[PDB]
Amino acid sequence: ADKGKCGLPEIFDPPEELERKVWELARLVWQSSSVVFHTGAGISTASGIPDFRGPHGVWTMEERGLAPKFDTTFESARPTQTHMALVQLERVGLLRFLVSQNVDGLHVRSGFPRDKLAELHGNMFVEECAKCKTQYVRDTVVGTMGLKATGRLCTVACRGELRDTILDWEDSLPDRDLALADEASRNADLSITLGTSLQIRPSGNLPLATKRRGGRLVIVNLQPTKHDRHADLRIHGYVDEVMTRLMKHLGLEIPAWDGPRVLERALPPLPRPPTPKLE
Amino acid sequence: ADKGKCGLPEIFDPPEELERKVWELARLVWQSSSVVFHTGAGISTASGIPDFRGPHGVWTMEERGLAPKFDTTFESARPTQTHMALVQLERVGLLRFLVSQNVDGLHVRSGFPRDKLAELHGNMFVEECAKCKTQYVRDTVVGTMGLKATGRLCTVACRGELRDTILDWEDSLPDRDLALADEASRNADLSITLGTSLQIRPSGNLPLATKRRGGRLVIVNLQPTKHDRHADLRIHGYVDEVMTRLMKHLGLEIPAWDGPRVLERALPPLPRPPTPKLE
Amino acid sequence: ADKGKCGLPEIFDPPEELERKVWELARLVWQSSSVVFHTGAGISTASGIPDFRGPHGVWTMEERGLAPKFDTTFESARPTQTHMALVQLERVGLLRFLVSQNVDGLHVRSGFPRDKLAELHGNMFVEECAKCKTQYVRDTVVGTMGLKATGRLCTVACRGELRDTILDWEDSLPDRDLALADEASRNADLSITLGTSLQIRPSGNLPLATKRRGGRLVIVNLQPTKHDRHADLRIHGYVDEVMTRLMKHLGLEIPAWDGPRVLERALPPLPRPPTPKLE
Amino acid sequence: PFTADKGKCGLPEIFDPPEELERKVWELARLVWQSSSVVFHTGAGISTASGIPDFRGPHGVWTMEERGLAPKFDTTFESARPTQTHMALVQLERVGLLRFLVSQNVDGLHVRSGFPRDKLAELHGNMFVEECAKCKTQYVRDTVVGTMGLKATGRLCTVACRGELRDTILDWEDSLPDRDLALADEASRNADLSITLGTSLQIRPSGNLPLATKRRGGRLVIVNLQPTKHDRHADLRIHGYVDEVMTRLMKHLGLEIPAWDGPRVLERALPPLPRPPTPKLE
Amino acid sequence: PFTADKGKCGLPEIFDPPEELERKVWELARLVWQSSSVVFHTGAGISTASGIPDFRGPHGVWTMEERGLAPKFDTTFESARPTQTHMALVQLERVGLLRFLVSQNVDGLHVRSGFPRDKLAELHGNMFVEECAKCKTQYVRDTVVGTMGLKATGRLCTVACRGELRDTILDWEDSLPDRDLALADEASRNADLSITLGTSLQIRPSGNLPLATKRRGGRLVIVNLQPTKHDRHADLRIHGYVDEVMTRLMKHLGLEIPAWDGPRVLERALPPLPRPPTPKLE
Amino acid sequence: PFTADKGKCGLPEIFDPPEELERKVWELARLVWQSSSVVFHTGAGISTASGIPDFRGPHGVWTMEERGLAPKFDTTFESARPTQTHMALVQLERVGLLRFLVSQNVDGLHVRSGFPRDKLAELHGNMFVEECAKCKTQYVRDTVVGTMGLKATGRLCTVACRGELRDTILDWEDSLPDRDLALADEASRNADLSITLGTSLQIRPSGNLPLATKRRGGRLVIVNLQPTKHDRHADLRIHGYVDEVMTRLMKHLGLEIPAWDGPRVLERALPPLPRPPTPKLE
Ligand SMILES: Nc1ncnc2c1ncn2[C@@H]1O[C@H](COP(=O)(O)OP(=O)(O)OC[C@H]2O[C@H](O)[C@H](O)[C@@H]2O)[C@@H](O)[C@H]1O
Ligand SMILES: Nc1ncnc2c1ncn2[C@@H]1O[C@H](COP(=O)(O)OP(=O)(O)OC[C@H]2O[C@H](O)[C@H](O)[C@@H]2O)[C@@H](O)[C@H]1O
Ligand SMILES: Nc1ncnc2c1ncn2[C@@H]1O[C@H](COP(=O)(O)OP(=O)(O)OC[C@H]2O[C@H](O)[C@H](O)[C@@H]2O)[C@@H](O)[C@H]1O
Ligand SMILES: Nc1ncnc2c1ncn2[C@@H]1O[C@H](COP(=O)(O)OP(=O)(O)OC[C@H]2O[C@H](O)[C@H](O)[C@@H]2O)[C@@H](O)[C@H]1O
Ligand SMILES: Nc1ncnc2c1ncn2[C@@H]1O[C@H](COP(=O)(O)OP(=O)(O)OC[C@H]2O[C@H](O)[C@H](O)[C@@H]2O)[C@@H](O)[C@H]1O
Ligand SMILES: Nc1ncnc2c1ncn2[C@@H]1O[C@H](COP(=O)(O)OP(=O)(O)OC[C@H]2O[C@H](O)[C@H](O)[C@@H]2O)[C@@H](O)[C@H]1O
Ligand SMILES: O=C(O[C@@H]1Cc2c(O)cc(O)cc2O[C@@H]1c1cc(O)c(O)c(O)c1)c1cc(O)c(O)c(O)c1
Ligand SMILES: O=C(O[C@@H]1Cc2c(O)cc(O)cc2O[C@@H]1c1cc(O)c(O)c(O)c1)c1cc(O)c(O)c(O)c1
Ligand SMILES: O=C(O[C@@H]1Cc2c(O)cc(O)cc2O[C@@H]1c1cc(O)c(O)c(O)c1)c1cc(O)c(O)c(O)c1
Ligand SMILES: [Zn+2]
Ligand SMILES: [Zn+2]
Ligand SMILES: [Zn+2]
Ligand SMILES: [Zn+2]
Ligand SMILES: [Zn+2]
Ligand SMILES: [Zn+2]
Fold it and tell me: What whole-number distance in Å separates Cα of residue E186 and Cα of residue E178?
């Protein structure tokens, strides 16, 4: 398979400059009416799950003929500070939609509302019914990858064949998830990309669609990305450090993780701090 | 009055078998899309309120020419672990409707949402307006039984006659409550009966209507019931022990009781654990 | 400007009588289906913000050629026990609408829901867009009074002129806020006025509109008011003392203040205690 | 054993009318406020609202035995939830309004509610506790041990002993554990108020301890639905449900009754918490 | 009484501009961080944002008296809610950043906020507290006792005494309670930082105690809207509202200001809580 | 320095199959329940799930060095969040199931999780802590000090000293701090159970301390993905992720793993909290 540029050196913005940029980001969150986050494997490295195209990334290790390292199971992985921050942004109405490429299930398990998430590449923990299209979010990883049969049957009242939701190398993106994602991206005045290299054809382009009709793009990545030149702001730092500085400037706590929890529909919005004066 | 079979010996399932059955129940809660609970006086014995047809039950004591025992007032009675568990099941979306024969007011006082409860036999604590059909949930028991005048007047803007809601021996069941209850029972793939003997004509039949079109019935009672042969699972144990084991297997806390609280309309659903893999 | 009667002596109801009246008020809250609060500067004196027409009030001090005293900034002012009590009344459904003359921003900052508040005289902390009528709730006081330009521009996607929302001496009342307020007052069976003298022409009359078609008026003020003769109950005491006694009789806690928080839309109602028996 | 003296059983119940009841609970609040040293004495009446029948009440174990009937249990000892009264006493210890607690119940619900073991004397023992014959070390288990009358359970001591574990349930001829009796006698002796909840006070050492408070000026309060052995020695008798009494009392004191996290053992009392200031009295 | 020395009243207020204000609150944070022993001294200025007028401020009791006017109260002593400043000091004690607290206020709001009585010296007394003439025992009441100048209230001691209860409000000629002064003098003497909030420091023993910190190297900080007696002895003077200053300070320290559960007395300090690690300084 | 003995690096990992894994975590729960004195020994394996690479694991610093590669950090030491394992150990101290904690990590996450410093021995030091050469006083900072090998940071002591502040990071030839080693040796000596999480036990004083538990009857448990120096001395070896093991263990114990409020220092352990009653064993 065509696996794109792997193992680029990383960039570390100096602290003075890094604080300047997170204040810029905060201003843009404040200035905007419609914010989408797009997330990749990078938001999960700090919970012990390796990325694909970083120094110790799955593709990168393969090329040096090495195995990537897991410091946790998918089951025992805890959502990062960045995961819980996105939960809080959605709950106070500063985050309209969230689009993720990750198959690791941590967005859902963090208690992010499923009706505001597009899982572009699917979910280790989710089976679909080949007959009635019903989704089961399970407590362990299903067992298969590539939309093959798990050997469990639908229970609605059906007995249809349940399959995995992990695309293989030629599978089309789920249409509902891709549709919602394209809508959210097109109709945004701010897209922010966290821990994605933006190299995958459909998924990595959607942030650019925010730039059509005047909208700002922000990119938060340790490595260069495919679209660095299209950004209004590029932040080279650990997303956790970036996201904790950001919540602090927004006057928002990062909520505790109750443990693995599914929320299907978003709850009505909670109160948030008032906006600073700007310009 | 025709008062049915009273004082049957009780059954105690051995522990090994009891744990096997509560795992069966949990599987059925997991497998189902539409769960109704039906509750009788048995869920209230552990808060000091005696049942009707048990060893020390009101009807049973009468026959041996004895008085039944109250270890609490209706006012000072605290909802049981089983009451608070049903509150939590509704709040995480594992319980669609609840149908109760009890007049003791503990469902409402536990903070169960009234728009998801049918009080088939009425409520010590509730007056209705004979004119505009408005319901007042009071902090003490009204004073009368049999739909007679309390001597308090409606306050909407009416001055109509407020009466008790406790049926006497020939009164028809409230039509709205009976209607909602029959709907919830018919359109369920799982009914579970807790602390009811199922001997009363309209009320005790509704669980059977779940069995039409493929639906499962579960019965949790210390004594035999009228419908033991129709069940898919029979659990002979204390509902509190059963319900605490069940919540544990579902990965759900039993909430604290804030004290006496009326919730008219159900709130949108809270997150719940993901489902195990089954078969 | 015509500034009305200033500096009247205050009245202090004796304790026996004061407790009798707060029990009367509580009965009326219990008896009613539709309660509006109207609030003036008096609910803010206990957080260090002086009133207009009291002994040490802005107008009153001017006449004796004195400056009124601020013991806090608008920014550092904390909502009073009366503010947080009104938050709790709205959240348990005992308060339908709230109408305030205060420009101090404490209702909004207490986390009262904006869709249930009419700010009749505007808000130090709020800018409006002269073009698209969009409102920005800021974290500091805007800088101008009298609907003049702040020198900040709209950010929707507009670049329109943002102005203050503080009426000057001839400006018409905001039409949406006045409209909602007149509706809420007309269709109420109980209006309660807290810390207002009711001297301002549109604002001070709205409580009277509750008295049309049988509705009760209650007035809580240390000084005489314009409309004392129209009231069913007059309570001469500190609103904080009155409101804490009231919540106690209603069996309701006064919530902690999380700090400055904007809630745009009201959340669905929380459970409340059941009603006593009355007459 | 069989011929043992089981006392007066099944006496009629008394119900103070609502008026006389509120005035009495207000009077108790006053005695708590006025007192520098409050001991509580509890019996099986604090456990009936959690599904456990008493001994000498209308459906009490002894009372049903005399009529040839069986007491009814509405739960196991394991699934039993501490009452409003149990949780209210945890709080009174946590704000310093309760010096000591002396109970005759073996149901374990005091310990399971999180009451600190160093401020409680379990006069008749505890179904959940086994001792070591050698070590004298106490294990608090998540289930009932199996035996009564201080017999070997089948488990051994795990200090590093391998000594014999035994139940703590006294039999008819068995003396009281000397440590619990001694602390209970001291706490009762130097109390300026004893309040007895759900006990009829017929058992010889246990039922007399509140009288030791009445020597040297101390006040005694008896809350019970039936007459009790010492009704004549009381300064205040309250005929009502201990839950109603304790919920009113706490309300007068301005204290909230704590949630029960589930079965939880606390060996040693934590330092005191803030409590409301005292009303002005006379 | 009438002729008594009431000091300089109604001085003009000073307002540090926003810039100079943030730099000064950052400088205070640094002094807290650097110091192993922080005492606070409070006066009536911490109580004005809760509706209680001061003595020597523009609308202060003495200041209005001199012009022939009356001070205004925006609440009773009973309905008065502790300020952001009161609750912030509770927290600083709970994380170990405050060794002792020395207040001249008689409004009781320190005690009512849950500040532990063993780490606070009530130099001028407390409206809510009566002593026993005989016992010397202190009762903290839910309402103001009635009298000032150490006169009998009409209540008697309830230790088991029947001794005379008296107010603790000092009069003009009355000495300071020796215990509170002694602890305040010790805490001030061995402090390496004293911070004074809302006091003008004119009263002779009370106002001098922060200077005792300045002997043997100690730093003194004065936060006050008006000049104060000792402005010249300070290492840092902050002209702003004590609430704004304390809310900024806590934010710099990474501490949250606690909710007030309502009127609550705590006799003895609880053990310390975790607090954020220190910034690197110079 | 360069030639130093770095031990066996990059050994293969072992994965106990699910069945054998649950039976082993149940067996550990039993050993905790049976034991009166539990010490934990932690190494860099408890920090890998928070983005910090270990030393001798497959991508461990030493292991990558040997292959000519660089270890990867998924966060700074400052933005690093304590793991499920870190927070689970805080709780076990708070309910009295953990007597002492002995760690070889310099990452500071134990202290930052709110683990009380008086029940923990930081054998190899702490990036966030500077000592005073003169005072021997320790400052816990909000950022990493700058240096390793006990060299001057550039800051001075603020006790009132002006002494030299130094890092606490041991170098290759540096002895262990005598106080931490002494407490660790005592706690290990008198423990009836040692449990080692994420250490390969190759460092000479630190790795041997769990063996001191095995003298005079004590049980030793090793939880580690790779073989360790002392695998043969263990009574129980668990090959799995320390998070999975600790989350199962806590569930068996009926304890919840606490939220992390953010970076918070606690000098002295608080008194114990209630914990569930013990299961009946054999
Ligand atoms: N803590 C961190 N902070 C910031 N950036 C980080 C961090 N850790 C890693 N990164 C950066 O995070 C970036 C991760 O980029 P890639 O590894 O390509 O992941 P994707 O989500 O874009 O891959 C998309 C799909 O391709 C796959 O085949 C699967 O199908 C995926 O679903 C790097 O550039 C790191 O520098
Ligand atoms: N803790 C317990 N766990 C399980 N079962 C229990 C428990 N306690 C009691 N039971 C069982 O609980 C069952 C209770 O059954 P019945 O007493 O007939 O009550 P109903 O609600 O069905 O009576 C319906 C109406 O009839 C009346 O006239 C009123 O009008 C009622 O509204 C017994 O079989 C006990 O074994
Ligand atoms: N703690 C207290 N408790 C009760 N009453 C109080 C308290 N404190 C003060 N009061 C009473 O509170 C009353 C305050 O009345 P006014 O001062 O006229 O304020 P408004 O809101 O009615 O003025 C309306 C507009 O007029 C202005 O020009 C602005 O445009 C305002 O928006 C007094 O009668 C006090 O006795
Ligand atoms: N809800 C209630 N509220 C108040 N009182 C109650 C309640 N329920 C019951 N009572 C009263 O509670 C009282 C309980 O009286 P007894 O049953 O003799 O209990 P003991 O603890 O004194 O028995 C001591 C020993 O006797 C044995 O030999 C064992 O060794 C026991 O340990 C009754 O008078 C009820 O009226
Ligand atoms: N919000 C505020 N922020 C800051 N400072 C304030 C504030 N409000 C007022 N102030 C200042 O707070 C200061 C208060 O000064 P004084 O009123 O003399 O109070 P004391 O506590 O020193 O009086 C001591 C004794 O005097 C009597 O005889 C009694 O016995 C008293 O106990 C002023 O300078 C205000 O500028
Ligand atoms: N998630 C995990 N679960 C369980 N074990 C793990 C995990 N991740 C890693 N491990 C294991 O964790 C183990 C860590 O072994 P080492 O890296 O030698 O750490 P130390 O603390 O013993 O090094 C001591 C000193 O050595 C230096 O010189 C410094 O001075 C250090 O302080 C491996 O065996 C992994 O298999
Ligand atoms: O602790 C004693 O009983 C246990 C506690 C208890 C209670 O608190 C309330 C109640 O309604 C019943 C009740 O039965 C319990 C019990 C204990 C046993 O050891 C036992 O064999 C049994 O069948 C049942 C006990 C003590 C005694 O001294 C005694 O003589 C006796 O017969 C029993
Ligand atoms: O404690 C003293 O006053 C009380 C506290 C207080 C305050 O904190 C702020 C304020 O704005 C006013 C204020 O009045 C209070 C007060 C106390 C009385 O005893 C009293 O008779 C009264 O009318 C009112 C006091 C002490 C004094 O030494 C004194 O000389 C005096 O006149 C009064
Ligand atoms: O504390 C030591 O390192 C720090 C802690 C640490 C860790 O916990 C896990 C990890 O994956 C890497 C790691 O690097 C840290 C570090 C410390 C330094 O002082 C330093 O100069 C550096 O580059 C990086 C240390 C101790 C040593 O004894 C030693 O010999 C050494 O080289 C380093
Ligand atoms: Zn299907
Ligand atoms: Zn009607
Ligand atoms: Zn606009
Ligand atoms: Zn032993
Ligand atoms: Zn005395
Ligand atoms: Zn030093």
Answer: 12
**Which of A89, A80, A40 minimizes the C-alpha distance to A193?**
A40
Which protein residues have their CB within 5 A of the ion that is ligand 14?
E 132, 134-135, 137, 157, 159, 161, 163
Long-range contacts for A2-6 (Cβ within 8 Å, ≥24 apart)?
A3/A52, A3/A53, A3/A59, A4/A53, A4/A59, A4/A197, A4/A199, A4/A200, A5/A53, A5/A197, A5/A199, A6/A52, A6/A53, A6/A57, A6/A59, A6/A60, A6/A63
Residue E203: CB within 6 Å of ligand 5? yes
E127: tokens are 């409206």
Interface probe for E, chosen from D31, D190, D213, D278 (most Cβ of E below 10 Å), is D278
Q: Terminal CA-to-CA distance of chain F, rounded, Å?
A: 53
CA atoms of D25 and D239, how far apart (whole Å): 11
Reported resolution in A?
A: 2.5
Least CB-CB distance to E241: which of C54, C73, C244? C73
Q: Using an 8 Å Cβ cutoff, are B198 and B181 in contact?
A: no
Give the atom of ligand 2 at the shortest distance from the alpha carbon of B57. Answer: 17
Token pair in block for residue E61: 């009791």
Q: Which residues line ligand 9 (CB under 6 A)?
A: F 44, 52-53, 61, 71, 105-107, 148, 169-170, 172
One-letter amino acid of B31: Q
For A275, phi then psi, to 5°, come to -75, 140
Q: What share of chain E is helix, strand, coil (3-state, %, to 5)?
A: 30, 15, 50
Structure tokens given for D82: 């501490």
C140 and A268 in contact by Cβ < 8 A? no
Contact E212, E15 (CB under 8 A): no
CB contact E217 to F (< 8 Å): yes
Single-letter amino acid, residue D157: C
Please count the other Cβ atoms lying within 10 Å of the Cβ belonging to residue E182: 12
F and C touch per CB criterion (3+ pairs under 8 A): no
**How far is it, in rounded angstroms, from Cα B36 to Cα B218?**
10
Dihedral of alpha carbons B81, B84, B90, B92, sign: negative
Contact E125, E169 (CB under 8 A): yes
DSSP character string of B37-100: EEE-GGGGGGGT---SSSTT-HHHHHHTT-----SS-TTTPPPPHHHHHHHHHHHTTS--EEEE
Mutation target vs A (from B275, B278, B279; most A CBs, 10 A cutoff): B275
Cα dihedral across residues E92, E97, E101, E103: positive or negative: negative
Residue B121 a catalytic site member: yes
B77's CB contacts (< 8 A; 6+ apart) are B44, B47, B48, B49, B104, B106, D49
Domains and CATH numbers, chain D: 18-124+176-253 (3.40.50.1220), 126-174 (2.20.28.200)
Contact B263 C270 (CB under 8 A): yes
Which structural technique was applied?
A: X-ray
Probe target for ligand 2 pocket from B101, B205, B220, with the most ligand atoms within 8 Å of CB: B101
Q: Is the dihedral of CA C65, C66, C68, C73 positive or negative?
A: positive
| E162's tokens | 């029947």
Q: What single string gives the DSSP state of each residue in chain B?
A: --------------HHHHHHHHHHHHHHHHH-S-EEEEE-GGGGGGGT---SSSTT-HHHHHHTT-----SS-TTTPPPPHHHHHHHHHHHTTS--EEEE---S-HHHHHT-BGGGEEETT--TTEEEETTT--EEEBSS--S--SS-EEEEE------PEEE-----TTPPPPHHHHHHHHHHHHT-SEEEEES----SHHHHHHHHHHHTTT-EEEEE-SS--TTGGG-SEEE-S-HHHHHHHHHHHHT-PPPP--SS-BB-SPPPPPPBPPBPP--
